[PDB]
């Protein structure tokens, strides 16, 4: 059979954090006990910048300049810390998409190298023809 349906295009995405207890020699406040990296990337670390313009990570208010804008790949940031907290993640798509910001969050994990990584997909419903061309450009 055949039927008309809303257009949908999916793009695989990997996001989350890694963490490691810091050794003898520290990088950095003395209070800090862990090194951690929060990130958004593609599978096999393939480029995602062709449909993602920038990624903004908002850290806890205890961090200086908690709004960290990463406007070029790799869309990640490495920091030091002592505590676990919720990091707000805003994904901005390229201007061709004419899309609202994609908002989600990730709970930074430091305790059971520790890692908290998700392998999901971003679903674009009703994309415009131009952004569709970009998404299909692979």
């Amino acid at each position: 059979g055949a039927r008309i349906k809303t257009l949908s295009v999916s793009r695989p995405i990997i996001y989350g954090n890694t963490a490691k207890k810091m050794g003898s020699v520290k990088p950095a406040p003395a209070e800090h006990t862990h090194l951690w990296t929060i990130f958004v990337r593609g599978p096999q670390n393939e480029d995602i910048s062709y449909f993602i313009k920038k990624v903004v990570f908002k850290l806890h208010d205890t961090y200086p300049n908690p709004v960290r804008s990463i406007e070029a790949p790799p869309f990640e940031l490495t920091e030091t810390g002592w505590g676990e907290f919720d990091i707000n993640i805003k994904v901005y798509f390229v201007e061709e998409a004419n899309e609202k910001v994609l908002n989600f969050y990730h709970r930074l994990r430091l305790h059971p190298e520790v890692s908290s990584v998700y392998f999901d997909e971003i679903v674009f419903n009703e994309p415009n023809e131009e952004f569709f061309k970009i998404l299909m450009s692979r």
Binding site: H60, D61, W82, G83, F85, L110
Partner: peptide, 8 residues
Amino acid sequence: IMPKDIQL
């Protein structure tokens, strides 16, 4: 106020 402890 947002929570931030050694472990959540």
